[PDB]
């Protein structure tokens, strides 16, 4: 379909887009959507694209707001944490004697 990967699609446009494109433009509306986007990306390819863009294009605003992103990607891939872990599924509880009656 002629739709971007990450675009906001409010309810009415969602209804008409689904009616026109059929059951192809799959969309979600919750934390599961964010988890799906976070889990269904590759980190190394995005890091390579970011490094190439930063090396090629230079500007007053382009030199910034992108080094932070590439540093985040590098720290995320070296430290070992997966991105989908930011959307928690199981919630731990404090031991009872630390929250007495």
């Amino acid at each position: 379909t002629n739709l971007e990967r990450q675009q906001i699609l409010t309810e009415e446009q969602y209804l008409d887009a689904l009616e026109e494109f059929g059951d192809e433009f799959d969309a979600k509306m919750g934390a599961e959507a964010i988890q799906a986007l976070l889990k269904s990306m590759d980190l190394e390819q995005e890091c390579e694209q970011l490094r190439e863009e930063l090396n090629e294009t230079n500007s007053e605003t382009k030199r910034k707001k992108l080094t932070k992103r590439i540093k985040l990607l590098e720290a995320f891939v070296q430290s070992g944490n997966k991105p989908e872990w930011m959307i928690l599924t199981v919630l731990p509880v404090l031991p009872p004697d630390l929250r007495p009656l």
């Binding site: 872990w85 928690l88 919630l91 731990p92 509880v93 404090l94 031991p95 630390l98």
Partner: peptide, 11 residues
């Protein structure tokens, strides 16, 4: 130890 438990109570 209490601080470690309270931090682990978050993700």
């Amino acid at each position: 130890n209490v601080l470690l438990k309270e931090i682990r109570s978050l993700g």
